[PDB]
Amino acid sequence: GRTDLLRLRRRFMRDQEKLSLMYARKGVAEQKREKEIKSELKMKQDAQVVLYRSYRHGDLPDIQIKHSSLITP
């Protein structure tokens, strides 16, 4: 219980801000509409492609790859 004081202060609502809370919920909802629109438009695109091999850099191709690395692709 470390956030317990933080839980207290975040729940210090007794300045009677019910209308303020609902308005904050409203603004959050509008931003959620915007962000959701953006996310939907983004995800219709092809998702990021997954790889299947480790890789190393040198002056030569490293033949030390394993059978798994070869056949998973």
């Binding site: 219980g1 317990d4 004081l5 207290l8 729940r11």
Partner: protein
């Protein structure tokens, strides 16, 4: 809110920059608070301070265990509930640093504070009431050391008016707080009858 405390806060910051009961005057203030005679002006000054200074005396809060509790008990400024909840939040912000299970003084202080809060726990509001309930749950499940259940004030809280309109549900949620603990559902000790104690339950049922 407190405003003259700002230099005190600067003092705390400076000392913690420079910083067992190694005295940087917390012996002086330790005595200044341990007495339940310290004036409410100075009492609340020290209270707000130690709220803001809980971090510095972690492997010290056990010695601070008794003051805060006796500070917590029978609190009599911005509001009694305000400082009560703030200080108990500070106390439970540590759990292994100190426990009110040593001298029976802290144990009885904790029990008396429990009675105070369960007397006080209610809101016309929704969450902050449930926030208090969760406060009770957190304290009982972080100590579980000397904590004992009255069941009597509890009984009248949940037995209620035989509600044609929901009111005693506060006592029901208190029972649920107990239920979250592995504590006995109701000690069949004397109580009042130990049999109808559940007849009132099934009545409100």
């Amino acid at each position: 809110r407190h405003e003259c405390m700002a230099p005190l806060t600067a003092l705390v910051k400076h000392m913690h920059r420079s910083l067992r009961d190694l005295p940087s005057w917390m012996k002086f203030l330790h005595g200044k608070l341990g007495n339940p005679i310290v004036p409410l002006n100075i009492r609340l000054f020290l209270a707000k301070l130690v709220i803001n200074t809980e971090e510095v005396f972690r492997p010290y809060a056990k010695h601070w265990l008794s003051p805060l509790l006796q500070l917590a008990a029978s609190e009599n400024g911005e509001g009694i509930h305000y400082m009560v909840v703030e200080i108990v939040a500070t106390i439970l912000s540590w759990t292994g640093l100190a426990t009110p299970t040593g001298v029976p003084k802290d144990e009885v202080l904790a029990n008396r504070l429990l009675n105070f809060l369960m007397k006080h726990v209610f809101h016309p509001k929704r969450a902050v009431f449930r926030h208090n309930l969760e406060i009770i749950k957190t304290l009982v499940e972080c100590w579980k050391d000397c904590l004992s259940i009255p069941y009597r004030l509890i009984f009248e809280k949940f037995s209620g008016k035989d509600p044609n309109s929901k009111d005693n549900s506060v006592g029901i949620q208190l029972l649920g707080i107990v239920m979250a603990n592995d504590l006995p559902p109701y000690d069949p000790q004397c109580g009042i009858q130990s049999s109808e104690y559940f007849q009132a339950l099934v009545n409100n049922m």
